[PDB]
């Protein structure tokens, strides 16, 4: 069923979560990538990334306020993926597709990986 | 704009936030309505409700783990609105529209209020 649905709701929720992120409101984690720091909400990171879901469902790790990622991870690539988590928008460019696909494979973000391949398989 | 967008992303994020809520994963607040308890995430409540946004941006209130709502609030009405926050789906019925519109006006949920009126203005 009887339920009615508000089409822009899920996107409106995301818009607000990103405004809370930009204003540093109720952010509970710091992600460190090559000496650069990214403040986020653990639940948004879990909802998006299979890696972060594994990290925050771990009895010891769920308690950490700071998470250091693999040193190979480019901070720009991570920043472009953190923005996608919060906006549904991916700033995919020829200059960053390699760095962004490598960051999405690591974070277990299947849909980013999928399209990332398609753009290079068409570029070749 | 150059950005590409994944259409189901925002809804997929919401689907996962609701699965975390159902499994009681990283829930940080307890909402009390007429002796009944609702476990949620403060950021989702803020993203949806103008009342909860005011509560969790308040220097003293943001620190509370338990929030007691006005006694007039029906727990079923609140439960139906908490489900809408997490799913974008509203279980609107003739038997609950009065209790659900009164709960949406209090929580400052303009879009629920708007449609709630429309259904009664057409019922009269």
């Amino acid at each position: 069923d009887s339920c009615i649905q508000f089409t822009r709701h899920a996107s409106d929720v995301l818009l607000n979560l990103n405004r809370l992120r930009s204003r540093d409101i109720l952010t509970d984690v710091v992600i460190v990538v090559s000496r650069e720091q990214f403040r986020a909400h653990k639940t948004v990171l879990m909802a998006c990334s299979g890696l972060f879901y594994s990290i925050f469902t771990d009895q010891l790790k769920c308690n950490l306020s700071v998470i250091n990622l693999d040193p190979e991870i480019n901070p720009e690539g991570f920043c472009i993926l953190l923005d996608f988590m919060y906006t549904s928008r991916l700033n995919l460019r020829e200059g960053n597709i390699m760095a962004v696909m490598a960051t999405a494979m690591y974070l277990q973000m299947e849909h980013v990986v999928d399209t990332c391949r398609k753009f290079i398989k068409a570029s070749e | 704009d150059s950005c590409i967008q994944f259409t189901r992303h925002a809804s997929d994020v919401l689907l996962n936030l609701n699965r975390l809520r159902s499994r009681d994963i990283l829930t940080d607040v307890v909402i009390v309505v007429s002796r009944e308890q609702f476990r949620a995430h403060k950021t989702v409540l803020m993203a949806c409700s103008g009342l909860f946004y005011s509560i969790f941006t308040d220097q003293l209130k943001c620190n509370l783990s338990v929030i007691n709502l006005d006694p007039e609030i029906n727990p079923e009405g609140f439960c139906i609105l908490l489900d809408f926050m997490y799913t974008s789906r509203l279980n609107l019925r003739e038997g609950n529209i009065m209790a659900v519109m009164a709960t949406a006006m209090y929580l400052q949920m303009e879009h629920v209020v708007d449609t709630c009126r429309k259904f009664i203005k057409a019922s009269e």
Partner: peptide, 5 residues
């Protein structure tokens, strides 16, 4: 917005 899902 509201629609039938």
């Amino acid at each position: 917005a509201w629609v039938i899902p």
